[PDB]
Amino acid sequence: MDKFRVQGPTRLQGEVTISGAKNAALPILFAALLAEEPVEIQNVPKLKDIDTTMKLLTQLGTKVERXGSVWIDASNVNNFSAPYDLVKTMRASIWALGPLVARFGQGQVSLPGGCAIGARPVDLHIFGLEKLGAEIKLEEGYVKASVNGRLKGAHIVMDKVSVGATVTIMSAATLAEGTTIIENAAREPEIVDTANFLVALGAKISGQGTDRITIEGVERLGGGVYRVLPDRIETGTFLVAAAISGGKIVCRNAQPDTLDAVLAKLREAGADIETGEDWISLDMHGKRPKAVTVRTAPHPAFPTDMQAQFTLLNLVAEGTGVITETIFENRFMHVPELIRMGAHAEIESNTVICHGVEKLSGAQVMATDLRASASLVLAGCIAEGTTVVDRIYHIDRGYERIEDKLRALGANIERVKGE
Ligand SMILES: [NH3+]C1CCCCC1
Ligand SMILES: [NH3+]C1CCCCC1
């Protein structure tokens, strides 16, 4: 059980190169199962889920190799069943189902059990494929799908916004007969990236990024080269790292237009920001940030995945700020940990009232959410003394070696194996 020992306070300044988004690389890697010709997917991060995905694709008959790119040859996929042993640690494995049924007419994926029913993650994927004409078979532990001929385009109205089901329906629809229209489609940049990857292969999709996506099915998809977009949450995390430490940073290989809400909030906190084609710079000019008011909402609004980071920013800012979370009902576990580090905050339902303090104090802390855990590491960078963040494997699964990037910005951080 690795931990990070962080010693502060340190001002974080320098340059950081943003990694590709795991949340775009994953749907793209599964969409590659539709490709009849070789594909090179560039800017893919080296994270556990990518390894799990490559192993799963290999089990299906895909030829896969990687470095910064992942090379895929799905010309000879010949096993349409994703087994429990390879999918048990990754819910994203459901994304193998739609491409297999759309291209080969059959697919099966193992699913984890549970006593709870109703609004389970996989449900909308199942009903989406059923609307496209697939026959679905369910038994506890798995979902099997098949189609007699080709899937058929359909007009689908999503009752609730779902990134996962939008990807499943959009990807499978590329090989359906006719036109598919997805109403109330998820608008996330990762949806746009996946749609653009499919178009690079020969698909016909429009409306990605808006609440209505239209797909005109084609007979087959080819191959090509595609570069995964930058991780917007990693970008925001490093921008906040500079903003809370009186720092100055340049994030390279960034995509500013995926962070409009975040950049606006950082400007309200007092940051001097400039943006280029593929970069963002932030300079606090040695100043403490000013408190801000934040309400999370679906993209393109302020992202819930930046909420913990901005809570930390408010907790060391000048003034009182309120953070309101409207996406998740219990995403404030970072707060008690920051209170133990000296922060002043009150939890009122789905809001946290923050009263900024000048300095935090080191403590032994831990959070299970990836973003909350990364925020504790950042707090450790600016807190007086030593902070030990436990169970950092959560961070390791979503950030490509964060301690090395932070160390290059001036952080005093060490990975400790055990104690
Ligand atoms: N054959 C491909 C995989 C290794 C790198 C060059 C292309
Ligand atoms: N008997 C089969 C069910 C669908 C995937 C391939 C195996």
Curated annotation (Swiss-Prot):
Pathway: Cell wall biogenesis; peptidoglycan biosynthesis. The keyword Cell division applies. The modification 2-(S-cysteinyl)pyruvic acid O-phosphothioketal is found at residue 115. It is found in: Cytoplasm. GO terms for molecular function: UDP-N-acetylglucosamine 1-carboxyvinyltransferase activity. The keyword Cytoplasm applies. Cell wall formation. Adds enolpyruvyl to UDP-N-acetylglucosamine. Target for the antibiotic fosfomycin. InterPro entries: Enolpyruvate_Tfrase_dom, Enolpyruvate_Tfrase_sf, MurA_subfamily, RNA3'P_cycl/enolpyr_Trfase_a/b, UDP_GlcNAc_COvinyl_MurA. Belongs to the EPSP synthase family. MurA subfamily. This is UDP-N-acetylglucosamine 1-carboxyvinyltransferase. Phosphoenolpyruvate binds at residues 22-23. Its EC number is 2.5.1.7. Keywords: Cell cycle, Cell division, Cell shape, Cell wall biogenesis/degradation, Cytoplasm, Peptidoglycan synthesis, Pyruvate, Transferase.
